[PDB]
Design an enzyme around this catalytic site. Sequence first.
Site, PDB file in Angstrom:
ATOM      1  N   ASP A  13       4.052  -7.619  14.293  1.00 58.80           N
ATOM      2  CA  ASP A  13       3.521  -6.803  13.190  1.00 58.80           C
ATOM      3  C   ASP A  13       2.308  -5.968  13.661  1.00 58.80           C
ATOM      4  O   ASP A  13       1.275  -6.509  14.016  1.00 58.80           O
ATOM      5  CB  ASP A  13       3.114  -7.724  12.029  1.00 58.80           C
ATOM      6  CG  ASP A  13       2.734  -6.959  10.758  1.00 58.80           C
ATOM      7  OD1 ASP A  13       2.206  -5.830  10.856  1.00 58.80           O
ATOM      8  OD2 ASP A  13       2.958  -7.508   9.651  1.00 58.80           O
ATOM      9  N   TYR A  55       0.859  -1.172   0.000  1.00 58.15           N
ATOM     10  CA  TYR A  55       0.000   0.000   0.000  1.00 58.15           C
ATOM     11  C   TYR A  55       0.900   1.228   0.000  1.00 58.15           C
ATOM     12  O   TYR A  55       1.725   1.373   0.908  1.00 58.15           O
ATOM     13  CB  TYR A  55      -0.881  -0.038   1.270  1.00 58.15           C
ATOM     14  CG  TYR A  55      -1.938   1.048   1.387  1.00 58.15           C
ATOM     15  CD1 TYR A  55      -3.182   0.918   0.752  1.00 58.15           C
ATOM     16  CD2 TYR A  55      -1.709   2.194   2.163  1.00 58.15           C
ATOM     17  CE1 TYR A  55      -4.172   1.896   0.896  1.00 58.15           C
ATOM     18  CE2 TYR A  55      -2.690   3.184   2.302  1.00 58.15           C
ATOM     19  CZ  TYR A  55      -3.919   3.025   1.668  1.00 58.15           C
ATOM     20  OH  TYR A  55      -4.891   3.985   1.802  1.00 58.15           O
ATOM     21  N   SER A  84       1.825  -7.945   2.154  1.00 61.51           N
ATOM     22  CA  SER A  84       0.763  -7.086   2.702  1.00 61.51           C
ATOM     23  C   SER A  84      -0.361  -6.819   1.702  1.00 61.51           C
ATOM     24  O   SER A  84      -1.137  -7.722   1.390  1.00 61.51           O
ATOM     25  CB  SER A  84       1.356  -5.763   3.206  1.00 61.51           C
ATOM     26  OG  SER A  84       0.403  -5.054   3.990  1.00 61.51           O
ATOM     27  N   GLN A  85      -0.487  -5.590   1.208  1.00 55.02           N
ATOM     28  CA  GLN A  85      -1.536  -5.348   0.214  1.00 55.02           C
ATOM     29  C   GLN A  85      -1.319  -6.325  -0.952  1.00 55.02           C
ATOM     30  O   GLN A  85      -2.270  -6.859  -1.524  1.00 55.02           O
ATOM     31  CB  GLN A  85      -1.466  -3.917  -0.323  1.00 55.02           C
ATOM     32  CG  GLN A  85      -2.218  -3.716  -1.644  1.00 55.02           C
ATOM     33  CD  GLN A  85      -2.186  -2.298  -2.081  1.00 55.02           C
ATOM     34  OE1 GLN A  85      -3.170  -1.553  -1.921  1.00 55.02           O
ATOM     35  NE2 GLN A  85      -1.047  -1.883  -2.625  1.00 55.02           N
ATOM     36  N   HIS A  93       6.282  -6.000  10.347  1.00 52.84           N
ATOM     37  CA  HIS A  93       5.817  -5.742   8.973  1.00 52.84           C
ATOM     38  C   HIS A  93       7.062  -5.284   8.206  1.00 52.84           C
ATOM     39  O   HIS A  93       7.299  -4.080   8.080  1.00 52.84           O
ATOM     40  CB  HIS A  93       4.796  -4.605   9.010  1.00 52.84           C
ATOM     41  CG  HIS A  93       3.862  -4.592   7.846  1.00 52.84           C
ATOM     42  ND1 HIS A  93       2.895  -5.553   7.665  1.00 52.84           N
ATOM     43  CD2 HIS A  93       3.722  -3.717   6.820  1.00 52.84           C
ATOM     44  CE1 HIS A  93       2.192  -5.272   6.582  1.00 52.84           C
ATOM     45  NE2 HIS A  93       2.672  -4.162   6.051  1.00 52.84           N
TER      46      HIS A  93
HETATM   47 CL   LIG Z   1       5.380  -3.587  12.361  1.00 50.81          CL
END
Ligand SMILES: [Cl-]
Lengths: 316, 318, 317, 317, 319, 317
Positions: D268, D90, D180-181, D297
């Site tokens: 995360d 993102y 992620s995204q 993350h």
């Molecule tokens: Cl994080």
Amino acid sequence: QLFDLSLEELKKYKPKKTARPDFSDFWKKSLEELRQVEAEPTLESYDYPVKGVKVYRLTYQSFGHSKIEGFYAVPDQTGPHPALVRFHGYNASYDGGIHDIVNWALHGYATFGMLVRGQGGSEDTSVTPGGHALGWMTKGILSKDTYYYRGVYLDAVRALEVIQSFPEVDEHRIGVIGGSQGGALAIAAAALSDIPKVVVADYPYLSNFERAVDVALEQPYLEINSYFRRNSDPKVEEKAFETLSYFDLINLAGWVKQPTLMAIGLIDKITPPSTVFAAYNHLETDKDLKVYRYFGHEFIPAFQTEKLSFLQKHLL
Amino acid sequence: MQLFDLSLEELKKYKPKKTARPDFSDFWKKSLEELRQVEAEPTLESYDYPVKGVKVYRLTYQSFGHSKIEGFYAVPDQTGPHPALVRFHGYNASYDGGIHDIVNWALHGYATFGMLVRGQGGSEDTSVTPGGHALGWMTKGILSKDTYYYRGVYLDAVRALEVIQSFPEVDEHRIGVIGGSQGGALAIAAAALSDIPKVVVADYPYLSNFERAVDVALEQPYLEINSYFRRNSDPKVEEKAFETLSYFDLINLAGWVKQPTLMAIGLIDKITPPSTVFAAYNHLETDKDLKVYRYFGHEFIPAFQTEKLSFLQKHLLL
Amino acid sequence: QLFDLSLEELKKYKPKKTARPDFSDFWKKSLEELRQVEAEPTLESYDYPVKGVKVYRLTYQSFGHSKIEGFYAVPDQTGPHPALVRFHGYNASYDGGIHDIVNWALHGYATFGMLVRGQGGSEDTSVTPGGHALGWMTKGILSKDTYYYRGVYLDAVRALEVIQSFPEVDEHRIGVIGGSQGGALAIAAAALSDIPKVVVADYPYLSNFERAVDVALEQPYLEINSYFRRNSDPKVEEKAFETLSYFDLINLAGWVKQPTLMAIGLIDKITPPSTVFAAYNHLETDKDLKVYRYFGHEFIPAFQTEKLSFLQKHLLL
Amino acid sequence: QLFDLSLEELKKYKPKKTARPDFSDFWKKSLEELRQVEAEPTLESYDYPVKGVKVYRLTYQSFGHSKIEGFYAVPDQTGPHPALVRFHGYNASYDGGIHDIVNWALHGYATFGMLVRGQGGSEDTSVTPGGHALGWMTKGILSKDTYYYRGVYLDAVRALEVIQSFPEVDEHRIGVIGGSQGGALAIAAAALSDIPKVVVADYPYLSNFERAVDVALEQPYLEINSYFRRNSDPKVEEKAFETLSYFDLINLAGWVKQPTLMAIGLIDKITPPSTVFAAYNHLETDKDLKVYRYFGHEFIPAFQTEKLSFLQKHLLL
Amino acid sequence: QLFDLSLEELKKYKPKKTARPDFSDFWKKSLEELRQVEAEPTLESYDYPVKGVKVYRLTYQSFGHSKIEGFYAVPDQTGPHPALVRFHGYNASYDGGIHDIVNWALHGYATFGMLVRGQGGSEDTSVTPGGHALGWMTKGILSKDTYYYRGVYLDAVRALEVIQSFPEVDEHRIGVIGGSQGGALAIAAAALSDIPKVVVADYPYLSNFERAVDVALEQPYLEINSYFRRNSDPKVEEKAFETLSYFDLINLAGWVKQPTLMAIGLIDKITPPSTVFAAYNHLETDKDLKVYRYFGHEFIPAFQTEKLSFLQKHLLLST
Amino acid sequence: QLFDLSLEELKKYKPKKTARPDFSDFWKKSLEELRQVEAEPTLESYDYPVKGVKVYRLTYQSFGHSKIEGFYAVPDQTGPHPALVRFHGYNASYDGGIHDIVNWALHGYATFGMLVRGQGGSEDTSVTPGGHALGWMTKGILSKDTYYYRGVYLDAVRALEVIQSFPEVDEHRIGVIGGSQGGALAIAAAALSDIPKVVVADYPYLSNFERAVDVALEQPYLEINSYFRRNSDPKVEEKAFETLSYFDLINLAGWVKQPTLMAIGLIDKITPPSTVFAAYNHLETDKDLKVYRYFGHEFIPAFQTEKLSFLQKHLLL
Ligand SMILES: [Cl-]
Ligand SMILES: [Cl-]
Ligand SMILES: [Cl-]
Ligand SMILES: [Cl-]
Ligand SMILES: [Cl-]
Ligand SMILES: [Cl-]
Ligand SMILES: [Cl-]
Ligand SMILES: [Cl-]
Ligand SMILES: [Cl-]
Ligand SMILES: [Cl-]
Ligand SMILES: [Cl-]
Ligand SMILES: [Cl-]
């Protein structure tokens, strides 16, 4: 983000009262000492760029012969008018909150914004008996007679006696309102005087002190923690909480008989949801508690609509 | 931290013009006369403490406004007279009266009294609060030199000196005043207002050059002033507040100090900016020395503690 | 603490205009595209707990056939009434600012709070041509024609033409006000339209972009820096700033003929003092800038009094 | 530091699906609208300092006639080549992620880094219906037809359709990867299309929205919270989650039939462990979730070895 | 946001050298001590999930008889091959940076990622003489002979001497690369040895120490400040700076004759722009410095293209 | 603010010991290696502005032939005197902590402030076997034989043997004291040697390592987490904890037979309450734990009084 008791839990949270055997006697005696001071209120016109409202600086004598003040704004039309005593946030009063006071008058209420002793304004003649942490939360904390908010609560009752005496004010349509510190004074005032018809309190402060010092993540409840750090005698802590109990909303809420409206944000770190649900759950009266999941200790739009509706219904 | 204020070459030359009003001297003469009218009526009571060779007491005395000031007093457990020290604490920085530090000073050979500053670390403050002010003591009664918080505090400092030298076990000729920040300011103020102290030691003194301080400090408490002007926006209020503050500003009181003075400043200090401390230093006209620490801020500076002890030993102990 | 140019430097700060030769033509063209869209406004009653004021949800068609909206509150009494078009801050509109719109009506002004495209509300029909940094600051930044604020500025011009047409509005006593993004919209509307009589702009945004990205210490100017970080072609930075010049207050301020009142806090890290002084110093009209040493990007009580006195003098008069 | 459900609790966390009764129809219908737009892809030579690989700029038409792009790097040798469609984070695409795409081609994969609408590149012809919080998370959130991720997920599927059609590509050896995204677009792509043979998703986003907004401690899930603060109507919150349910991985997971490898770090704060474990536990296929206690993350070194070995086994070999 | 000297000023910044009269003698002596230690390198195959590249764990003996190690990845094809020695950042090596090492090999370079003593790996036999501040920056700072980077710099030289001896490597096509601490090792190695052909240094560290401690806003230059706070002797500060002068890039740069490519972000708070410009302005060789207004101490996408083009032109497609 | 286990739960927290079967032999082996090094202590007059105390710079040889040092201050009057070996905090020693050392002597104790290897002073001859995270916590953590605290604990035992041999010291009245790192050293010293009569330890460090890395919120326990992030082999983590177990206070506490006084602050984020209660609960000796609700990892004024009274009682009077 969420951090306190879950919502299901908050709704049932009702901590045992901490009020001492002499709780009512302390307030009776305090109200009697206040009564010994003649109010001698004064009203002086104050120019302000608004049409339809007349603004004044109001002053009156209160407990300890302290000169209390605040702006008083009145609709420019023939009365009797409904009225409001608005109380401000802790160390959060700028220029006496004059613009908001004028806006309340524009909505139709003769409105007085009592400035809290040493904060937004007003004189505080009560002496400082000894050391305390930076701020007003612990000034005179070692005795219920010397504590900072004794004089402040008595000032709130006196504001109501003064406003009630004005001919242009309808004594049956008076409300007390405020948020956080302001919310607590609103509630303390109603618990102590039957003058106010209704009460509106946004996330009231000064509630459930013993849990507050262990859950709040921001000032000003933490002033108490700072105080104990600087004065380590165990007896001091004992005495301070004993003193604090006389001003705690969970002990005063039981005396409120006026329809009451409160608000609380679930991410509030200043006045923890639990402390506010504690005060609420101690009220035995016409009451409603509006809960906002994504809000903290701030202006809550949706609640402003609720508050206006509530006041209009009961006062307008 | 990291350097932020004027360069060192500039700090050494920084001597801001005095802001004292024409009635500066009369305000203090008058204030001291009012203090003189309150009888000290000192009280001393034994205080147990786990130390050998020192006797500790809780000392109280009456001051300006009929205010009862207090603090711990520790004395070497041997035959006097003894040299003495009046130590002043930092803003909102006194824990349990600073007793362990006071006892330690007595172990070094000094009858030491740690005056507790009104409503902070202790002591009563009878002065009323005339009107609204910002959170803290910095702006209490700021609208008039007569009602300003530090008026009583400065007087309490002078009174502490008068009380201490009246003790038979104290060598009146060997008394020193020391303190850091708010404490250093009280030490310098007491020395400017009283000839009692022999020497002065001030670690990065506070309450100095207020008009620059509000624009340079990056941490509390000087910023309580800025906070006060935010809540009280009338131009006349800012003019009046600074007028009040001038009567208590070290750049105006310093020229009255006649005692050998030792001062310190850390170049990365955000609380009492280097410029504000050099200003107070540069207004002194007396036997003096400023120790500069490039890598320290508003904190305990080890190397200065040695300088400090050597200095007090030189002029008082020995 | 203090961080920008010294007050004496700020008072004289007047950076050279960045406007291109086709600057006047661009707005001329843009306003013609707007004129081609019929307003077709709609009004619908909206209940609110207040006496003496009537509230409405107003909508109208604007550039790109976008449906713009906002709350409109009218004093409940015999008009005509002076009016105000209020513009909200960047991503700072909560429930359309209904409570503040109502309060302006209580002060005697027929007030419309235009919701900015995609922020507080209102439809944005303009396509996203390519990638940009999170937020609205760089959407369509590679062309003056597709840039976010083109549609927004036009919507603000259109708001004035709609309000002006209301029978209960005195078209000769209309003011435009706003803070930050809102203050910029007020100035741009008054620069592009002779409808407003006066302007009040609290610390206006969208001003002196080239200095802004080098001095702001917080969002949203920094969205531009973020965009350059993700799109490193040197020619992109060049094109980006060319696009922004068409919307920069330092280039639009000179067209404002209405008296103007502005404010600036000297510790403001969102709309730096230098960028606000740049916009003010390019205005050539009856003007006044109130400077507040101890305030930043926030509500300044003392300036509210100034603001009320100013609008009263020129409008409620 | 640990903050979410304990590890043993996480392994057992399987939130009840929130998919509405018309979940399947909505997607069959969206895919149909996508099919109506002819891809018409274009490839142009793009110079890059690397030997053994040829890079291009690939573009194609997708949902709503939006021009989607990204870099396409191919091994400079005779095919058929296994392939990869890599999806980015993102607001985390810098210069199209070209360097990483080139590296993937060096590992032997014809790789295309699809750029997400308005973020790292690509056009988004979707209009903005009304107000929303800063960011893409709540654009068009009041309706499943207008929601930002509808077009994006469809671009993801179209990406696969385009690449497999390429002669130098072995249509039977195509993987979808992302963090992620991107981990979410790879999972959604696989759920919606049987084109990909395998899936690699590092800590996937857009999963278990209802818990995410209550546990996330950093952006961007919190954009939804911001949206609710600005549009307080209780029915809006209800509407927003109904919309989000159509794109939530806990509802799409059950359609993935491809072998899947995933990763999660236990500290995360962006994509909380419980939301990722939620997605993993709704998968009914050849799967494996790698847990890394000390990571958040970010790039997880030991998982790169896992991801490479997994792709090498199912595609390369 | 910006914080250091203006770009106009940076370009002109060239601080006077701090090198002592015995600067050259000290390095001759150190290289001679290194020479006295037989490399005795070992190579062990290392399994990795990639096609077309073979990986090894290489070790060798260096100064103080310390065993230095690191991953060495070779393109799986007949050479000779151009080669690279990659140096990592301060406390910034994860699992030996193997993934980046493999990728470099995939771009066509026999690559060795030297792990810095006690950080990413490698043994460090040097004793700790006395107290120092948390970190490696002040370890043995009271003497040039005992200072932490003395062993590391020599290790970088030995790495080049070892890689060059490999059959599959074209000794005339070796480059040294790295960012920050690693960019510093790159430069230092090129200054101390003529083995490398070219140098690529992203925002190099260990440069202009005297200014560094007054401008840096984050670690690890600040470990020096931390050290002075804990050891207040004025003479300790004087000696510390004398020791550091022997390893400072402003003093070593003048010895580099290899084409050199550098990078700096104007908002870098770790390696201040002025400290990097100081290093760059003291080089007298074929040089270029790419300046990036919007970046700090971090991966700069645009400079990766620059770096790859530079290595391709001097190594893979030439000499 | 509160964050660990509640007080009621802390009182009963006693984790199972992690001591390996070769734990006692490891220490016996270590102590014997120390014994093979002749102390060869040296004393040098050190000038300091204080009346009634004589100060010296003391050095002695220890494990690995390392030269340990520190200031030694003695009351300037006829002895024997009771004595204290004071241990300092992790990376928290400024100028040898000479002012505090002198103050202990003024309180009547011949005091030696041992400087811990490489931190406040003292040479550390042990070689760094390989890579570790920034700091001393993980130096040589792959083997109990090479770990940083092995030489340090031995150094502490040697300190006691040197001070007790001084003719002006009453070997029967010696105490070991310290905070955090210093507290662990006081405890470890008492567990390995019967020389100290009593122990005082403010919030001891190096305790219950396995919980600490999951509960600490600040450095330096987190250096271990950092270590694992940089060295991801699962077997490395396994080995790190086996090594740590030989130095963990929960395993050494059982050997302490001296009266012990400890303190803990409930909001301490450096040495979390549970880790200190863990150490305390493993002591089987005359012990007391002073609990301070409103304090963290810092000087606790109230505890200083307790400390002084306890020392006076067992050593002075
Ligand atoms: Cl994080
Ligand atoms: Cl009190
Ligand atoms: Cl809050
Ligand atoms: Cl006042
Ligand atoms: Cl500081
Ligand atoms: Cl664009
Ligand atoms: Cl601001
Ligand atoms: Cl929508
Ligand atoms: Cl050293
Ligand atoms: Cl940086
Ligand atoms: Cl190891
Ligand atoms: Cl702590």
